[PDB]
């Protein structure tokens, strides 16, 4: 009559690192990524570059940014015409064009103002290091595989055997679009891992562009925590994308988006400390702790340490509560 | 040599008061308490230093399946009812006995009649006469004990302390057999 299994929901706004957690939890406790496994992702690395570039190429027009080097007008046309769902090779009519566009101070000016449109986060990581990708003998590094972006529309569950205990790790959608489905995997939930992207504080939602991306991560949180099937289930808050906040907080200031924050500017820490405070205060039940951790999901060795400590708490609880 | 005594009866039929008088040797100090946490007491009958454990079922009386958790490995049951309440004499063969002899088969029962002093009191006679009833006489309680087949019928009162010791002296010697 054994019961050695434990469901965990990953939840939160889209683009907050739910899938990337599952990748690291695979790297750490699963079968790693092999060379053949990586070569599968090349198509998607290749794709992401176009997604990102086309994204800006359109931003130029939208925000009336002028291209500095006339010859890029062509380049930007050619690239914007490309169908991203069919792209499966980085060949040179384009490889040069995307390189030239990335180099135009006009596109960078546009990229510096990325807040004002929907561009992905690993654009820099890739578009800076084009020459490596563009190589005909490219084979994605585990970090490249960690930084790709295949957006989820489906509840795919991922089990992981770990010290004779199985943790069944659920990966849900993120955009308003998907959240209906979430309720079908609310079944025997032991703990709610909720992700917030620290660097969201200055952006607006992809689906509805009047509304601050943290304002909504915040709303969602309180909305889930409230729900009465989660009162017998712990909640663990992973404030993600710290590395991005640390670099972002030097230009874009918090207080302009959240004026309640009375701390200093360009202070990487003081900010996240406050952001954490926002969320932990929305905890309603005063007899229940609401565990928190600052994470960078593309840092395997940071995530190794975090989930390590998270388990020894999750186990600690569910032992006392006679679920094991 | 330890034994296990569980008490049983209707609400406010002097279950909790009876155990306080024995475990202290004193009346509750004019504040009738509610919780008597399980008390191992040192009694001595026929020269045998018994350490009889006392379990109260105070409140657990509207909950059919929960009482059965207090009954295993039991060696004696101080089943009782209040003298000042013939409605408590009604449930002895109706609710209690049938339940008891299932969860504790062949294990002895001591019927006890609590608050004998409230038989004589005129304030509890005029109160009962309204309900077209009367205080249960002893020649009704004995016939009940026979009918259900108890180890021995006894009477006492928590205010007097009278027959309180002698009921447990019976409850101890019964725990032997």
């Amino acid at each position: 009559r054994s019961r050695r299994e434990l469901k965990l929901l990953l939840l939160g706004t889209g683009e907050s690192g739910k899938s990337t957690f599952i990748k690291q939890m695979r790297i750490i406790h699963g079968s790693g990524y092999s060379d053949e496994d990586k070569r599968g992702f090349t198509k998607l690395v290749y794709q992401n570059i176009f997604t990102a570039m086309q994204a800006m190429i359109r931003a130029m027009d939208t925000l009336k940014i002028p291209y500095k080097y006339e010859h890029n007008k062509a380049h930007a046309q050619l690239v914007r015409e490309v169908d991203v769902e069919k792209v499966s090779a980085f060949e040179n009519p384009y490889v040069d064009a995307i390189k030239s566009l990335w180099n135009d101070p006009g596109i960078q000016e546009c990229y510096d103002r990325r807040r004002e449109y929907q561009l992905s986060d690993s654009t820099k990581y890739y578009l800076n290091d084009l020459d490596r990708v563009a190589d005909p003998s490219y084979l994605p590094t585990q970090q490249d595989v960690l930084r790709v972006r295949v957006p989820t529309t489906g509840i795919i569950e991922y089990p992981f055997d770990l010290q004779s205990v199985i943790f069944r790790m659920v990966d849900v959608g993120g955009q308003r679009s998907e959240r209906r489905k979430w309720i079908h995997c609310f079944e025997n939930v032991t703990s709610i891992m909720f992700l917030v992207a620290l660097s969201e504080y200055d952006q607006v939602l992809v689906e509805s562009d009047n509304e601050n991306r943290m304002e909504e991560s915040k709303a969602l949180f309180r909305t889930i925590i409230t729900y009465p099937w989660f009162q017998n289930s712990s909640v663990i808050l992973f404030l993600n994308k710290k590395d991005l906040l640390e670099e972002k907080i030097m230009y874009s200031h918090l207080v302009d988006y959240f004026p309640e924050y009375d701390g200093p500017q360009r202070d990487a820490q003081a900010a996240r400390e406050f952001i954490l405070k926002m969320f932990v205060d929305l905890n309603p039940d005063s007899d229940k702790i609401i565990y928190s951790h600052f994470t960078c999901a593309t840092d395997t060795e940071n995530i190794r340490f975090v989930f390590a400590a998270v388990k020894d708490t999750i186990l600690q609880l569910n032992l006392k509560e006679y679920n094991l | 040599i330890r034994k296990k005594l569980v008490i049983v009866g209707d609400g406010a039929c002097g279950k909790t008061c009876l155990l306080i008088v024995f475990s202290k040797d004193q009346f509750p100090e004019v504040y009738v308490p509610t919780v008597f946490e399980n008390y191992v007491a040192d009694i001595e009958v026929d020269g045998k230093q018994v350490e009889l454990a006392l379990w109260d079922t105070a409140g657990q009386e509207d909950y059919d399946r929960l009482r059965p958790l207090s009954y295993p490995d039991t060696d004696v049951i101080l089943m009782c009812f209040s003298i000042d309440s013939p409605d408590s004499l009604e449930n002895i063969p109706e609710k209690w006995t049938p339940e008891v002899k299932h969860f504790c088969p062949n294990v002895p029962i001591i019927l006890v009649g609590n608050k004998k002093d409230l038989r004589n009191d005129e304030h509890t006679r005029r109160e009962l006469a309204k309900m077209k009833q009367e205080p249960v006489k002893p020649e009704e309680g004995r016939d009940m004990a026979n009918r259900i087949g108890a180890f021995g019928y006894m009477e006492c009162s928590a205010k007097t302390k009278d027959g309180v010791r002698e009921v447990f002296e019976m409850a101890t010697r019964a725990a032997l057999q």
Binding site: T223, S286, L319 | -
Partner: protein, 327 residues
Amino acid sequence: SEEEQKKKALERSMYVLSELVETEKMYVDDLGQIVEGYMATMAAQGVPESLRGRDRIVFGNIQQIYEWHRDYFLQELQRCLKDPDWLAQLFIKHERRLHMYVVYCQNKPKSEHVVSEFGDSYFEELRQQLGHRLQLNDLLIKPVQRIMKYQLLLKDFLKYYNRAGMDTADLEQAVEVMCFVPKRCNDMMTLGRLRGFEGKLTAQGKLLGQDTFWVTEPSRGRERRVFLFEQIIIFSEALGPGYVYKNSIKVSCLGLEGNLQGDPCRFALTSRGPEGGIQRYVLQAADPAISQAWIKHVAQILESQRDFLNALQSPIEYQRRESQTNS
């Protein structure tokens, strides 16, 4: 000759409140005998080979209960001694937490079978190493008793404290709530004999209700006992007691159409899932007043559940709403 008895209401009630508060302490430390005595000692010394596979089954979830009482509930009862008006609101507050008593009660019959058979020649040893007056099987009843003594202590506050204010409404719910918890615990013993259902009955939310229905579907007539939890509804065959699983419908895919083709006694429940097919069961009831009851309540569980979803898809909007409900 009137107000001198209104002040006699207070003192007499403070004795009852102070019993609760001072018994909540002796209970905490009596659980502290269980948790950090018998379980701590057994962890340090070692687990017996006869009892190795069943270490936990003895102590149930008692560790969860202890640490709640010790580190939160007791402390709040101490605040209630110097603020007795605050007490009623507190017993409502934590209706959900007392679920831990259900899991313990259900896993109590198992202790006796794991204790009274396996290691009684072992608990003699630990009882004499620690040195308690009370044998293990005495301390492991404390909560079972304690949860049905909360209905009592509050019921006595209601007698004496009716005169010291007309917020018997705060204490009306407070007592109500604190009888329902022992009701669930009592009911969840019988429903522990549910064979042939994968999933823990305990963590399927509150057992709201249960009743007997005749269950058609396009026909296959059959008398069945229908349990209704917040997360699920179970169809079961009664064995006159003790029950067997037959079909389920999780509330996550539940649907309802009441008063079928005119009839007050008939409704239908429908299961439409993302991955499964479409099932549809017609429940016909005995007392029409039992049918109607169920429609109302299920049609509600749904109404609020379809609120939740709409709020997931629009969470900031729905928390502007709820912030102005609060204020």
